[PDB]
Structure formats: structure tokens, C-alpha cells
Amino acid sequence: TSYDVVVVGAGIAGLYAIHRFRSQGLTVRAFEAASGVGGVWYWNRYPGARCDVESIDYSYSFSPELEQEWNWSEKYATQPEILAYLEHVADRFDLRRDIRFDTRVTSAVLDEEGLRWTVRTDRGDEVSARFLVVAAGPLSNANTPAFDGLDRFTGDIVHTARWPHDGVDFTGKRVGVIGTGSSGIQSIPIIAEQAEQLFVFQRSANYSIPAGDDATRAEQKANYAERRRLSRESGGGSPHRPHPKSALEVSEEERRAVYEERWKLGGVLFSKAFPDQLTDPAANDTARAFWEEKIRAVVDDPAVAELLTPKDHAIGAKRIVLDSGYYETYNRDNVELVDLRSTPIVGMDETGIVTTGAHYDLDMIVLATGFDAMTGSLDKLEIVGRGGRTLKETWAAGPRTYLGLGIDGFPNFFNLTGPGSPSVLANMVLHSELHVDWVADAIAYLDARGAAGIEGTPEAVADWVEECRNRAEASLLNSANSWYLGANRVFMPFLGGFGVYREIITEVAESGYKGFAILEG
């Protein structure tokens, strides 16, 4: 029942945690709510689920052998391939024996005399950890929206968050998709190709750009070490940089050519084509205009194109979706886009969806749900720190951390890749590696000095909260209805760049953890 580390989650972060911590001789017990490893890549298996960041970059760097040995089948790996990859990883490093699956951690209570966390589970587990590491992921399922008479619909209801492992045949079916976030945008084109008829029920339109040899694949494998260095020192965790000159300080021909080149290689990277693209509203207007043009050129019907165009949002404010044949899908005879602002859904009946203006005969409804950002999973845990104060309570006015890694009243607790860190703003595999490594060094630091614990300082967290506030007040990611916002106004991620952030937390470590108190037994 005693372990050095308890890890919550068995996705990318938790799997690396187990490996890294055991390599320095720590005993580890991990809990995973799911049936197998993989996290988001295990749970989220709707058709066309796919990563945003090139798989060369969105993959582990910790093992030279694994990098050379594993062959990615395409530029942006789909969910089943990333799953197979993470399964291979648990196979190679014998991680599963230290994981208990189908087990949801419910509470963690600090014993302040001992500086241990007692971790409890819905399967009746009670374990004592020196260190609690939460690797619960940054994305959790947004609530299934309550529709009147959904329980009366005779056809099939399928949720993108709980996709049938053996798939769903859409052949011969009239299909209604509700939700046009990424899970919708990625599944729609596949649904339309085999469905008899597809109705897409859209509330808000989102920004999405296209996804897009043997001799060239062996070229990056030999240059992998240099590509990782660039990534670890970059702003977003990939070997890329923005243009030198400003958006509003270049030719139109040079503008179109820079946007066109950045249109090809990725959506997250298109957002950072120009330095002031996510800072100056007028600069963003150009990227917005360039995007609208491209979509009007591909969509046949100008009325549909307009409906596909996001109302009045800065491009990049919400993360740009990566699509494969999405906008082309609306040229098909068997797909109709229904504007929910004109005709809102007022309920379901036996035979389909009823809106304000028409009834829709359907055999199948696909609920393409979204994701809550950053605090969703942590919020389902009761973490009781010093004085018996929960993390939920101390975060009531917004997340407070130092570096994302320290919180006063929570010694020996580490929340990975969450509020206070770049989090989803950076390549999350490399971010996981950075954070797990940092935690492991901190533990090694404590062990070499006979110290019982480490704890965020009230002063350092206040300074960090302010630091995150300042980097964010400038950005267009800090919009009123922003994906990235917390309790209050609080923009949750660190917005200064991955390389900058990595530099900060490493120098903090090298200085003997200034801003943390080192605690004696």
C-alpha cells in the first residue's frame, strides 16, 4: 500500500512518468479509469480522429531506439495508430504491471505530519504515496447537451466520446450530426461518404484548415536529434518559427505567398505565420480574410460558404481544427447544413429532430461533443491539502500555481501540463517529457539532501499568477468567450513560449528550487 509515487492517468504523460520514475528507483503505482493505456487516444475513437501536430514531433524523444524503430504511416497520425504506438510503448517498457485499470481516483488527502498523500479509489484502493503526480490530461468531455424527447427517438444515438469499438455502418442511413467542433469536423467527411444523407446541425462555425516517400523518411530519422533541439527551444514544441517582419509591414504578394506556405504545413502553425497575428486585431483580420477566400473557393454554394464562415471571432483564438476534405463535403448532393441560429433544435421525437422550422427524418443521430479545457479532470478529484483545504477551494478565484508545478498548501503534489504551464499551447508529448523530467529531478534533489518534501511558496505563486496575467493580457487568445479561460478572467496557460518556459523551470531547478520551500522530515 506504500509507494514513492502515485500517478493519476495512463496516457502519454502517465506512461512516461512510470518509466522515468522507475529508472531512478522509485516505486510507482498508477491508476487509470479506462480499460487500457492511451488516454485521449484510448477514449476518443470517432471516425477520423487525428493529431494536430506532425507525428515526427508529436511522439516521444526519450528513447533513441523507439524513434528509429517506429515508423509513422503518415504526416498526421490517426487515433488508431497513435494508440498502437502508445501500446507498443507500454509493451516495450513493461509499464502495465504498475497500472490498475478501470479504477478512478476519487480523493487524495495530505497527512501533514508525514508529508504523504493517501489516495483513494472507486474500487476501494487505499494507497500512501510520498509524491502525488496527476497526469489526468488537459481535455475532458464537455457535457452531452440535454435534448427534449431524446429518449423517444427510435433510431441510433452515437456519441463521438464513446464510439463503438467495432464501428458504425452509415450505409443506407439518414444521419444527423450535432456539433461542429473538431470531433464533428473530423467525422463529418467520413460519415458523408457512406451515409445516404447527412444533415449537419450547426450552432457556431469554427476555423479549420487542410491536413495535406521512403528516401525522405530516412532523412528526418538521421536528423532527429537536431529537430528535437529546435523543438525544445521553440515557441510551440515544433521546429518552426514565425516570419521576421510584421503582418501589416509586407507586400500583398509576399503576404499571399507566406499565408499559402503556412496554409500547407499545419493549422496551429498557420496561426503563427506572422509575429503579430495573435496580438493585433487588424493583423488577424488579414489571416481571417485569407481563410474566408480559400473556403469560398472550395465551397460551391456562396450561401453555404458564408454559413461555414465564423461570425466574428479572431482566427487562432480557438485552436484551428485540422480537416481532411471537410469543406469539400458540403458540395455533395447528400449533405445539408442546417443553421441552428435560424432554426434551433427544440427536441427529438420517434423519427428524428424537430427544429423551429422543419422536422428531420433520421435513422441516426451523432452527438459530436466538445472538450472542456484544463481543469475538468482535476475538478472531479477531491485533493485535500494543508488545513484540510481542497484544491478546488484554493482555485475558486482562478488557478494559482508557481510554474504550474507548485501550489502552497500542496507539498509533494504535482499537476502535469496544466494551469501555469504552456499546457495545450505546446506539443504535449515534449511538454510531458519536460514536466515528468523536472519532477524526477526535484525528487532526486530531495533524496540527495535527506529532505521530506517540496512546496510552492505563497510569494512565488502570486508572482507567477501575475506573470501569466501579463503575458496573456496582450494576446487575442484572451478573448471574452475564450477556450483558455478560468474562474476569476484568468487565462490559464503560460503564454510566453515553450522554450522560454523550459528555460525558466530549469534555471529554477539549477538554483536549488527558489520559490519552493524545501521541507524536512
Ligand X SMILES: Cc1cc2nc3c(=O)[nH]c(=O)nc-3n(C[C@H](O)[C@H](O)[C@H](O)COP(=O)(O)OP(=O)(O)OC[C@H]3O[C@@H](n4cnc5c(N)ncnc54)[C@H](O)[C@@H]3O)c2cc1C
Interface with ligand X (CB under 6 A): 8-14, 31-34, 39-40, 44, 49, 51-53, 58, 104-105, 135-139, 182, 377, 380-381, 417, 427-428, 432
Kindly tell me the burial class for residue 349, based on how many C-beta atoms sit within 10 Å of its own C-beta (0-12, 13-18, 19 or more). Answer: middle
Q: Is 105 labelled as part of a ligand binding site?
A: yes
Task: At 325, list the grid cell.
Answer: 476534405
DSSP code, position 223: T
- In the block, cell 511558496 appears at 457
Alpha helix segments (H runs only) across 117-212: 182-194
395 marked ligand binding residue: no
32 assigned binding-site residue? yes
Smallest Cα–Cα separation from 211: which of 267, 270, 274? 267
Q: Is 58 annotated as a binding residue?
A: yes
| In the complex, least distance from residue 269 CB atom to ligand X, rounded to whole angstroms | 11
52 known member of a binding site: yes
At which residue does the C-alpha cell 435534448 appear? 147
Q: Collapsing DSSP states into helix, strand and coil, what is residue 460?
A: helix
- Could you give the CA distance from residue 155 to residue 419 in angstroms, rounded to a whole number? 41
3-state class percentages of the chain: helix first, strand second, coil last, to nearest 5: 35, 20, 45
Nearer to ligand X, 278 or 416 (CB): 416
Complex with ligand X: residue 173 or 240, whichever CB lies closer: 240
**Rounded least distance, CB 95 to ligand X, Å:** 12
CB-CB contact of 199 with 336 (8 Å): yes
Nearer to ligand X, 39 or 176 (CB): 39
- Measure Cα distances from 383 to 393, 404, 465 in Å: 10, 16, 21
Query: Could you tell me which of 371, 375, 270 has the C-alpha nearest to residue 316?
Result: 270
The response to whether 106 counts as a known ligand-binding position is: no
Amino acid at 357: G
Measured from the CB atom, the residue of 264 and 341 that comes closer to ligand X is 264
Least separation in angstroms between residue 479's CB and ligand X is 20
Q: How far is the CB of 58 from ligand X (least distance, A)?
A: 5
Q: Is residue 428 marked as binding?
A: yes
**Closer CB to ligand X, 429 or 460, in the complex:** 429
- What's the min distance (Å) between Cβ of 414 and ligand X? 13
- Name which of 370 and 456 has its Cβ closer to ligand X: 370
Per the annotation, does 100 bind a ligand?
no
* Residue numbers belonging to the annotated binding site for FAD: 13, 32, 40, 51-53, 58, 105, 428
* Residue numbers belonging to the annotated binding site: 13, 32, 40, 51-53, 58, 105, 180, 182, 203-204, 206, 371, 428, 483
* Residue numbers belonging to the annotated binding site for NADP(+): 52, 180, 182, 203-204, 206, 371, 483
